[PDB]
Amino acid sequence: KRRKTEKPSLSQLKSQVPYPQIIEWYDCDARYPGLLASIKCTKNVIPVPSHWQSKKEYLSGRSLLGKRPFELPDIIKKTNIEQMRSTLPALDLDYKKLHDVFFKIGANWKPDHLLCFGDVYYENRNLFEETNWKRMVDHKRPGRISQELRAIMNLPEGQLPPWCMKMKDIGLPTGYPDLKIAGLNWDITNLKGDVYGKIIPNHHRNYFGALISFETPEFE
Amino acid sequence: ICSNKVYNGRRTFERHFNEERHIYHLRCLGIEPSSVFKGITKIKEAQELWKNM
Amino acid sequence: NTVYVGNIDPRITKEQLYELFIQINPVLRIKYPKDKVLQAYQGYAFIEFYNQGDAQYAIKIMNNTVRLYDRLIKVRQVPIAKLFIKNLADSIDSDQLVKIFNKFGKLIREPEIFYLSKLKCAYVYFEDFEKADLAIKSLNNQLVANNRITVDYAFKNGKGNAKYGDDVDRLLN
Amino acid sequence: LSKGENVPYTFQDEQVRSNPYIYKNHSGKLVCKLCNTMHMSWSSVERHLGGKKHGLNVLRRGISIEKXXXXXXXXXXXXXXXXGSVGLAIQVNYSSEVKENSVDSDDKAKVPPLIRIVSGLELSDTKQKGKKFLVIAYEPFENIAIELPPNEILFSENNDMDNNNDGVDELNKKCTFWDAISKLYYVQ
RNA sequence: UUACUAAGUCUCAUGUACUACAU
RNA sequence: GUGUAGUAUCUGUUCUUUUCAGUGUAACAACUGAAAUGACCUCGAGGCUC
């Protein structure tokens, strides 16, 4: 009773904290709030996954209904057993082939997503969309437009995007100062296919561990 | 901080932290927006918190 | 920072939006809703850039520019004193109210005329708690158009508390 | 229980449906696209339709679908008295069919003179002020005013028995008379 | 231009699996 | 193609004494105890009300 009503306000607790935004309303009933704020707000600690205080047993997810059953890592998919055995609703294989797939072909191979120091998987999360996202931030760059989005845009080949004219009056993108586009800052004769422009960088090892040779263990 | 307003749910009040009027009371009060001040209730304490900012 | 985009074909997908706007500026995040009542896309998205400079830039260059599935793409960027007044005369026009309260203080909005009980009452919005105190001090229990009117704070219980002067002062600031 | 209707699968790329909602997904189960609820049997589907849940989602989806000659007349002020105090009475006279013979097109001609109490706080010159005026107005003739230093005189208390023809205001009906036959406006 | 969250408890029915146990 | 006992899981349905205090809870929830009756005012809300 008295101890329950003795609690300091969470904002009174914020001042003790160097990173006050992590502390939350429920920290008021922390039996040792001044300590718990220091631990929770300590540098490298990773806050408890928030699926607690929910009674849903951490997975009720509607998204769980729509998750793909599985996908082979493409290196293993090269092994062709996908066609040999149909998992969806005998296939003689070579020892050298499989062994080389894991070792010769797949030594340097690593899953593309993984996760980071403090990455924690909440129920509603799905990594796959973020994998295509990270891969997409990689492939796609300004000045280039795929033929699909080009067809939807109804832009014929050899013709500049509609924002090149408004970009002539307004100016180059503030975010891309080094961006070049045919007809304006960049040679129109170099206009080719899906690329109407490219960023021209103005910036222009061994890491003590350079192996200088790569030799995998041989099965034979 | 909001008109001594009444809220009928804790999820809803936790949604008040990101709102137009709530941020208007903060920012027009001189307490700048976003995520440090989320746990605010009374007008007073976040003033010393903003002095700490 | 964040820009609203609309008039979007549900066949426009997330990768297509990303590839579209990266041509304009770098895109921090894309929230592109997916209906749980149609299992598709509801035809408007939100693109959060890395700053309001690139945001406003994309608003200027992007608006009424790109044509996707023959439909044009749209882009759009994303607390005051209140006095209850009772027993007004039927000859009192809202504009007459405006004239009466302008001398005391600037009105943030127009008065609201409503009938209780037969009983003509109005809400008057002042930009200042102190000017509201002026219209109260002078106009409380006064006879206008041969009718005695009462001027006080409207309920929220009623306005004019101690924290109300404090925060309304700040909203003035 | 299906009443012989054919519900096409969701992936069959849409014959008009009874309810264009319940579908069958890639699997054999039945689903409500709005509600996103799975149903084992058509009986469960009918329970869903007859349930308040589905209806609420239908209303939400419908909300989504919606989403002057200026001539000074002649006044005759006179100190009156009755009981129990003192009041003022004014006798304003108007033209004797001299100029009103050219204008008779029932344009507010039926409207009698009107009086209003004005504060001197607002004047064309704005020099001095601080007292009230009992202004009296008629369409052609020029306005007229009478200064009222006394804060209150003849300001009665429920003279008549609360009858509601506001005319213009309580003041006019309460204490004015318009002898239109002789053109004499009395005010007290 | 809609800036992304709903079911819970009870009651009385329906849907579907299952566990010991016997011919 | 059966019967005995028993279990789990959907879905439908529906909101249990208005309040107070204690336990309880991260807060809820839940549990434990009691019970106002009368009068009035403005638009179910409100009372330094009696």
**Model resolution, angstroms:** 9.0
Residues C169 and C106 both lie in one domain: yes
* Selection from D87, D143, D154 nearest residue D113 by Cα: D143
Q: Are the beta carbons of A10 and B38 separated by less than 8 Å?
A: no
Residues C120 and C170 both lie in one domain: yes
Give the Cα separation of D157 and D174 in Å (integer): 10
**Burial class for C61, CB neighbours closer than 10 Å (0-12, 13-18, 19+):** buried
Residues C90 and C168 both lie in one domain: yes
Residues C72 and C122 both lie in one domain: no
Helices assigned H by DSSP within chain D: 42-50, 52-66, 170-174
Given C43, C60, C78, the domain boundary residue is C78
**Burial class for A172, CB neighbours closer than 10 Å (0-12, 13-18, 19+):** middle
Give the Cα separation of A36 and D10 in Å (integer): 52
Given C46, C78, C110, the domain boundary residue is C78
Residues C39 and C84 both lie in one domain: no
Helices assigned H by DSSP within D72-155: none
Chain breaks in chain C (C to N over 2.5 A) after: 78, 117, 156
The number of folded domains in chain C is: 2
* Selection from D109, D163, D157, C143 nearest residue D173 by Cα: D163
Residues C5 and C33 both lie in one domain: yes
Residues C61 and C90 both lie in one domain: no
* Selection from D145, D114, D152 nearest residue D129 by Cα: D145
**Which residue's entry shows tokens 């109490």?**
D117
* Selection from D18, D34, D38 nearest residue D26 by Cα: D38
Contact yes or no, B with C (3+ CB pairs under 8 Å): yes
User: What is the separation, in whole angstroms, between the first and last Cα of chain D?
Assistant: 86
Give the Cα separation of D29 and A65 in Å (integer): 13
Chain breaks in chain D (C to N over 2.5 A) after: 14, 67, 83
> What is the experimental method?
cryo-EM
Q: C81 near C125, Cβ under 8 Å?
A: yes
Distance between alpha carbon C96 and the CA centroid of its chain, in Å? Answer: 25
**Size of chain C in residues:** 173
* Selection from D112, D115, D107 nearest residue D94 by Cα: D112
Give the Cα separation of A144 and B48 in Å (integer): 51
Minimum-distance CB partner of A10 among B35, B39, B48: B39
Helices assigned H by DSSP within C25-161: 52-62, 94-102, 129-139
Q: Which residue of C has its CA nearest to B20?
A: C79
Give Cα separations from A120 to A25, A45, A125 (angstroms). Answer: 21, 12, 10
Residues C65 and C85 both lie in one domain: no
Domain that holds residue C101: 79-173
Residues C161 and C90 both lie in one domain: yes
Name the maximum alpha-carbon separation found in chain C. 70
* Selection from D159, D167, D131 nearest residue D146 by Cα: D131
Give Cα separations from C169 to A77, C160, C173 (angstroms). Answer: 68, 12, 6
Residues C114 and C94 both lie in one domain: yes
Q: Is A12 on the interface with B (CB under 8 A)?
A: yes
Helices assigned H by DSSP within chain C: 14-21, 52-62, 94-102, 129-139, 162-172
Give the Cα separation of A18 and C150 in Å (integer): 53
Q: Are the beta carbons of A163 and C60 separated by less than 8 Å?
A: no
Residues C104 and C163 both lie in one domain: yes
**Which residue's entry shows tokens 């006064």?**
C142
Q: Are the beta carbons of D60 and C37 separated by less than 8 Å?
A: yes
Q: Which nucleotide is nearest to D35 (CA to C1')?
A: E6
Strands of D147-148's sheet in order across: D114-119, D132-137, D147-148
Residues C153 and C171 both lie in one domain: yes
Give the Cα separation of A102 and B43 in Å (integer): 62
Output the CA angle D111-D117-D119, nearest 5 degrees: 140
Distance between alpha carbon A132 and the CA centroid of its chain, in Å? Answer: 7
Beta strands C27-31 and C2-6, pairing class: unpaired
Task: Answer for A53: CB within 7 Å of strand F.
Answer: yes
Give the Cα separation of A181 and A144 in Å (integer): 10
**HSE of A219 in the Cβ direction (CA atoms, 13 Å)?**
11
Q: Are the beta carbons of A12 and B40 separated by less than 8 Å?
A: no
**Burial class for D85, CB neighbours closer than 10 Å (0-12, 13-18, 19+):** exposed
Q: What is the DSSP string of A37-81?
A: HHHHTSTT--PPPTTTT--STT---SGGGG--S----HHHHTT-H
For residue C102, what are the contacts with CB-CB under 8 A and spacing of at least 6? Answer: none
Given C49, C78, C107, the domain boundary residue is C78
Amino acid at A44: N
The number of helices, as runs of H, and strands, as runs of E, in chain A is: 8, 2
A42: left (phi over 0), alpha (psi -120 to 50) or beta: beta
Minimum-distance CB partner of C39 among D33, D61, D168: D33
